Nucleic acid binder design. Sequence first.
RNA 1: AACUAAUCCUAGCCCUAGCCCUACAAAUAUAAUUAUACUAUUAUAUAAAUCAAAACAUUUAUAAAAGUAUUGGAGA
RNA 2: AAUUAUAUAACUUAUCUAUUUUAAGUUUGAAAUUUC
Lengths: 72, 96, 242, 70, 172, 95
Amino acid sequence: AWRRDIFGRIVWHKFKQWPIPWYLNKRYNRRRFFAMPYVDRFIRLRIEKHARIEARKRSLQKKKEKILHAKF
Amino acid sequence: GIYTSDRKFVQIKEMVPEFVVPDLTGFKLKPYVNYRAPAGIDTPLTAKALFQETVAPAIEKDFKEGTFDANNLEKYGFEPTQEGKLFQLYPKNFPR
Amino acid sequence: PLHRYPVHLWQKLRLRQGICARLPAHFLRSLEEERTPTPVHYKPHGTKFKINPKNGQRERVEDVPIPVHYPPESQQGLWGGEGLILGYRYANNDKLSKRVKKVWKPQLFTRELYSEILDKKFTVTVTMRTLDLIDEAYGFDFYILKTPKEDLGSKFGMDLKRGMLLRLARQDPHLHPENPERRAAIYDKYRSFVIPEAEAEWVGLTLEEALEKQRLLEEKDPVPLFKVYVEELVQRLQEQVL
Amino acid sequence: AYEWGVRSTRKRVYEIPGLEPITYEGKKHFVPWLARPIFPPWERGWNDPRFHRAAPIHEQTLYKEEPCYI
Amino acid sequence: KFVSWKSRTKYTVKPVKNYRMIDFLRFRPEKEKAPEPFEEKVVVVRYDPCRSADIALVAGGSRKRWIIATENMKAGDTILNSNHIGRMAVAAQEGDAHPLGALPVGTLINNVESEPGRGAQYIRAAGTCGVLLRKVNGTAIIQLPSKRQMQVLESCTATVGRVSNVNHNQRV
Amino acid sequence: TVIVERWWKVPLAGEGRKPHLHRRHRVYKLVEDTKHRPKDNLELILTQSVDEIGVRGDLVSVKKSVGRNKLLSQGLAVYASPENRKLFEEEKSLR
RNA sequence: AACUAAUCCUAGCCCUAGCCCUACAAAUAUAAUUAUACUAUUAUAUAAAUCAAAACAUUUAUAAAAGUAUUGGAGA
RNA sequence: AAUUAUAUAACUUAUCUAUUUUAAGUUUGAAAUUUC
């Protein structure tokens, strides 16, 4: 199933077979599938980082384009 | 195996894999194939293809005859549960 | 770059797309609609005009609502709009005097009220204003149902409203068990608040609860593709027979 | 000071009738923002000696009111 | 996550890795006895690492239990523990547990309990002795080491005599 | 109940804007607080008998918490809702 | 005409514009990345100060009307 | 030190509680201002 990690990302969680149920498994309950409140700042950074990646990519293409004009 | 009390190893026969080795006598398939043999275009099998090849003819004949009902869906190959089979399709409980 | 939509519009986009769009319209309307709470500690300005000091001319005036802090304990109780006011005070009500940090605490109490709809007596944190409001509402059950969420100012009261609304909606025999005749009177007495069952379920639900509820509603066991093909094959064959 | 009682200990939604509160049982994992589900007793399908508990003496068939001193 | 170190399941008089489990409820009815006055023998006066005063092993019937030692307890002494409120003065042997009703005014006492059944909590330190200031009917006045004079029911148990190391308060 | 008013007027933000609060706008004047005052009067019906404040069955106006802390808490008084009020008068009519 | 060295142009970047966003297996929060039970499971109060007032104390920004008026150790 | 010192804390009155016939004073001082 799809589950949210402590970092706020959504990732497919592969279920594991256990001899005991989840509610009786303290260690499985100890595993964290919840995101902390401070992750909101990180979420904004992730969106900004994605935009930054696109901006940097355009700069990389521009440098390649310079030689294309110079060569041709 | 399982380690019991007193730090003693106790091998479990059930958990020890048994290698099922096929009989290769009379088997004509070998590691390599002829260059004379034309290459095969990949046509992966799908649920639609499997259903069409095997299940469709049975239902088609039965539907025209009118002998179709929900209770007989298993007759055409539906499995209500995967329990009882050594190899369970989902959840996968068998190794390669 | 720069975000085309401001941060406040980001929430709107989520509400308009995804599982939020699939949420029931009645619940969405309840979430979307906002009703101002009834003033309790602040009154509107008596006069609508005053002399502007800077230009020496008469000018329109505005009302500044007093800041009031409502602790979460109020959401677990039934407060009549009262809340903790945190701020500064000037002794003797003259600005020339010393400023003292003061936290003003309304007198809080825990008392028991009988609910006809639920046929049970609930002991809850309450204030004197709520008790008067209950009398003004013509009963504790009426007060919960009649009062809006903002004026009610209680999550538990909304929880009571959800149960009361659902109970009235369903005509559930659970009301006043073994007294069917008494049950009818209560439903007739609170007939005004009868609503569809679906709407009553979502009354007072939190956003996290609502999202989980919709997820639970929309989650369905995967369809065996054998069944899907069987129905498709039968449907196509049936059409051919026609 | 002699302590009576172990010294170690020394220094709403559910109430609604006709509706069921949502719980993280569907999530299959604990989350603080959801109500704790009500779990029926678990059945392992087999008896584990490591987790087995001996029955009380009185429930034993061989239990006798008279005390036998050994 | 905090578990007290005094977590031994079974009360024992053998030193425990050593610490000896003390008993401050003097009149605990012992095995093979009715809830009536019973007598005990001071087996040995040992040293308690965790308490300033020295503990004397008091043994009676089928039960052996450590207790705080008074000023004159020595090995082989006889200690009586009575619940009955004596019509006349009850024979007083230092270290015996008797109701305050039985004892006469002026007798030095220790290991007293503020309330009946509370157990010994005061006058357990070295050289501490409680004076029975006054006695009236079912009420008595017990002076605790804190200098607080309190009035308690005669049912409260008090141990006669001062605590060991009689010169603890006189230490220079 | 507590009532407070800002000492310093907040500059008008116009028809459709929010004024920006400042430190001097954060100091407030207490026009009236029930805590400093003695308890205000409250209307209640005595459901029992209390010393020298009347007898059961009368309607008395008493200070809010003095009545609440003593009378209502002990059960001596009760709140007069319209539903029980009409029952009371009907019961009193039969009395 | 010699040694040590030097020579070069793209590696890439910067700002606006435009645009929101909705980009293998196996192992893992236990001791993270340890294929099955242990042990229940959990962030955050005005942002302050520095700084300016040549120190320091209330105080110190973070379309036109208009830098007009008021406010302010009437001073920054 | 001088001068104040409704931080608090106490008492008195309110306060809030029982019964029943924090605020305002004062005091300490968290401190404040200036001088030495």
